[PDB]
Amino acid sequence: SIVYAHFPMQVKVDGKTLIIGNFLGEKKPRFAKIIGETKVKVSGNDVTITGINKEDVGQTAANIEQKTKIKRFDPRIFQDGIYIVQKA
Amino acid sequence: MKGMRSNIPRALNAGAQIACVDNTGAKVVEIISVKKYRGVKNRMPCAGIGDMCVVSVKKGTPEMRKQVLLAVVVRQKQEFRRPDGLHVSFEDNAMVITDEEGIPKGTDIKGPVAREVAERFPKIGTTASIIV
Amino acid sequence: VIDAKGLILGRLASSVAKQLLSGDEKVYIINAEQAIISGSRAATLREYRETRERGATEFGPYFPKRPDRILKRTIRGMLPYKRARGRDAMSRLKVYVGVPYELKGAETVTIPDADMRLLSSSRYVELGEVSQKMGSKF
């Protein structure tokens, strides 16, 4: 699932990567790799990740979550990125 | 700070005495240190045109005398080259008492000042009369 | 010729050293880049890194980087290479990375002792991995 406060996000699938643009006032968009044939689909404020390999989908979700972590502030007041509402 | 088009050698040396050329009330100052200068071993700090440096008043009015202040160099006797190829030099070093930003305490400057300090510090440019 | 495909390093070196010293024709170790070194990954890498960067430039220990050079150096230690017997023995050893053209299709034999099948667990690394971690193109 997606969450944001002020800066809307442009999650766009392109090739074997997921590009995150405009994350917390971001000019250089971040890159998340896609492992295996794990087809991902973006729809509003949620992402669904299909696949036949359990470790593959798990690692893809982990990469997507780990790329979008803001690492210089307080989790109380800044809470943005992509979070897993349900494991594989 | 903002880069200068020209290239300025660091002529004046920490320990030098300059003749301040404004109407603030001081005649002679003593360069103590140069802002934004690390240095290496055994090297004395040095300052050139358009360098903000802390000084000490040696000759002037009693209230101004014995005061640590900030000032920049507006002229120097050591030659430096223009962007398009030419060398410019003066007969004497000079300095003006200012603040951290660049506002000079004096409202009148005597003699010419180099145009590069005029571009770096606009206030010195406006307060001056003749620029060469 | 001896094929170093899946053999323990010290066991192979000890057998080859002894039967060089006994006095015979020369010996050839081929595929000296997938020999096994039992032990955990991190400890092996740490020990070989410390061995590599240990000398002084003029006269310090110059530990080699190439895999066959490492195997030759390992055999060099089980052998009196300063004496005449040891130098003659060292003159009859040739360890090759891969398979040289002249030894192509040659009849092979193996040391039945040094076998990775004779190992309790799966805690080992291959020699080429350490060679590449030390920065060698082979």
Binding site: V3, E65, P75, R76, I77, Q79, V85 | - | -
Partner: protein
Amino acid sequence: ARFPEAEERLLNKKICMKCNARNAIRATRCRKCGYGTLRVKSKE
């Protein structure tokens, strides 16, 4: 901004009280030093 998922995956973990390593919830032993006592990540 306090949202459910962000607090779920950000500040819902226990902290080792000696080396400050963060652990899981249903735990009683630091995974890296084994210290017995674990507190909880500070709330608001």
